[PDB]
Each structure stands twice: as structure tokens, then as C-alpha cells.
Amino acid sequence: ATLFIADLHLQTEEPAITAGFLRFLQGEARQADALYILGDLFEAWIGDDDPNPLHQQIASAIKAVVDAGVPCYFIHGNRDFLVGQRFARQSGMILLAEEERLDLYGREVLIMHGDTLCTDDQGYLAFRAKVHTPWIQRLFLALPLFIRHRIAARMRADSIMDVNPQAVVDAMERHHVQWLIHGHTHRPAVHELQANGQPAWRVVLGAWHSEGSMVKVTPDDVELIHFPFLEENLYFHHH
Ligand SMILES: CN(c1ccccc1C(=O)Nc1ccc(S(=O)(=O)N2CCN(c3cc(C(F)(F)F)cc(Cl)n3)CC2)cc1)S(C)(=O)=O
Ligand SMILES: [Mn+2]
Numbered sequence: 746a747t748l749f750i751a752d753l754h755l756q757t758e759e760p761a762i763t764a765g766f767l768r769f770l771q772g773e774a775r776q777a778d779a780l781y782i783l784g785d786l787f788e789a790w791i792g793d794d795d796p797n798p799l800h801q802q803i804a805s806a807i808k809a810v811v812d813a814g815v816p817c818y819f820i821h822g823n824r825d826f827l828v829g830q831r832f833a834r835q836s837g838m839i840l841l842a843e844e845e846r847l848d849l850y851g852r853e854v855l856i857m858h859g860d861t862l863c864t865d866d867q868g869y870l871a872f873r874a875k876v877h878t879p880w881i882q883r884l885f886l887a888l889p890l891f892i893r894h895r896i897a898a899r900m901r902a903d904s905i906m907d908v909n910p911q912a913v914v915d916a917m918e919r920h921h922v923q924w925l926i927h928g929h930t931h932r933p934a935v936h937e938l939q940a941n942g943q944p945a946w947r948v949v950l951g952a953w954h955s956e957g958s959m960v961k962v963t964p965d966d967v968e969l970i971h972f973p974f975l976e977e978n979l980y981f982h983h984h
């Protein structure tokens with residue numbers, strides 16, 4: 746089986762989510778054929794030179810899954826678009842483009858973070874166009890670390906709408922697929938539509954707010970799965 750997760754929004758202020766992700770990496774992830782992280786792994790990112798210890802802890806935990814034989818892939822989200830090749834090397838992850846077409850046990854499946862499907866939010870799209878401009882990224886990354894931290898703290902306070910239906914059909918027909926997996930919208934669901942004159946499905950991941958969420962693809966089915974962060978130890982009413 747192949748696993749997909751997204752929108753964990755890891756941050757030091759939310760240690761329970763970090764604990765849940767480490768348990769996931771130590772258990773379920775080790776049995777997968779591959780692990781895809783479709784964006785928003787971190788709540789924020791200001792560059793791979795950030796000494797934030799959470800970054801090194803996450804990188805080591807993912808690297809252990811990679812060393813165990815499970816290839817791990819990453820597509821950027823709107824929160825962590827500055828994740829670069831230095832962190833990819835530390836974690837063992839492979840960085841993918843904003844859109845990729847996968848063969849999963851015969852299925853042609855398109856994957857993306859999903860924010861590019863939100864073509865009605867012109868305000869966010871203008872932000873995305875700016876922060877994805879290469880010279881703007883290079884200029885920001887050249888700033889001192891403490892300056893970048895101050896900018897990000899203010900910009901987070903300065904800065905979710907849903908996808909546009911026609912944008913979904915356009916992407917699914919551009920890639921000629923009947924399956925699409927994405928996150929960003931934080932609305933876990935399975936939507937049936939029509940693309941390429943045939944039934945098609947858009948599978949949406951959930952954010953790691955109170956419980957975990959993943960999509961598991963097998964040769965036989967597609968599974969949207971919700972699970973608790975930590976080991977809920979059972980313990981023991983009247984008639
Ligand atoms: C969907 N959302 C939005 C909806 C509408 C609009 C935006 C978003 C949105 O995604 N905003 C957002 C994303 C990441 C962070 S950040 O803290 O991680 N960080 C990243 C690096 N970053 C700069 C800064 C610059 C420069 F200073 F030059 F401007 C350049 C460059 Cl290249 N990167 C500083 C900030 C902070 C805010 S929403 C509800 O916010 O989630
Ligand atoms: Mn998200």
C-alpha cells in the first residue's frame with residue numbers, strides 16, 4: 746500500500762501533533778510501499794538554515810523511515826513552500842513538483858497540495874505568485890535569520906476557501922486521470938465527478954487538528970483513514 750498525508754502544520758507549540766507523527770513514522774509508515782507528504786507538513790518555514798530543533802527531529806524521524814526501505818516524497822504547501830534541497834538531504838525525502846502523475850498499482854493518480862485549485866481566491870493567488878517568484882525567494886532567503894523570523898511572525902498574523910469545480914476538471918483532464926489526491930482545504934472527503942468522459946474521483950486529506958488522517962491506496966481500493974495521535978490505552982458501567 747501507498748500512504749498519503751498532508752496538512753500536519755507541525756509546530757513546537759503543538760507537541761501532541763509532533764508526537765502523533767513520530768508514532769505514525771515508527772509504525773504504519775514502515776510497512777508502506779512509499780510515503781507521500783502533500784504539503785503543509787510544517788506550519789511555517791523560513792529556510793533550511795533555520796536551527797529550529799523540531800526541524801532536525803522531524804528530519805531524523807523521516808530519514809529512519811527512508812533507511813528502512815520506504816521512499817518518502819514531498820510536495821510543497823502554501824505554509825512550507827521554502828523547504829529546499831538541504832532539508833531533503835537531511836530527511837532523505839525527494840522533492841516533487843507542484844503536480845505529479847503517479848501509477849499506483851495500475852491507477853493513474855494526480856497529486857498536489859490543492860491550493861492551486863482554489864482559483865476563486867484571487868487574494869491568495871496573488872500572494873502565491875509573489876512568494877513563488879524566484880528572485881523574491883532568493884532575496885528573502887538572503888536576509889539574516891532573525892530578520893526572517895520577525896517577518897514571518899508578522900506575516901502569519903497578516904495572512905480556507907474551497908476548490909473551484911472547473912479547476913478540478915481542467916487539472917484531471919490535463920493529466921488524463923480519473924483519480925486525484927490533495928489536501929490544503931482541510932475537508933476530508935471523496936468527491937465523484939466526470940473527467941475525460943468517464944467517472945473520476947477527488948480524494949481530500951484531513952488536517953491533523955485533533956486526530957490523524959491519511960489516504961491509503963492498495964491494488965484493490967482507496968481508503969480515507971482517521972486515527973488518534975497517541976496510543977489510546979483501553980481501560981474499564983452498570984445494567
Ligand atoms: C492559505 N492562506 C493564505 C491566504 C491568503 C494569503 C496568504 C496565505 C498564506 O499561505 N500565508 C503564509 C504562508 C506562509 C507563512 S510563513 O510563516 O511560513 N513565512 C514564509 C516565508 N515568508 C516569505 C516572505 C517574503 C517577503 F517578506 F518578501 F514578503 C518572501 C518570501 Cl519568498 N517568503 C515569510 C512567511 C506566512 C503566511 S493561510 C490562511 O495563511 O494559511
Ligand atoms: Mn493546511
Ligand SMILES: [Mn+2]
Pocket residue numbers: 784785822823824858860928929930
Ligand atoms: Mn495549505
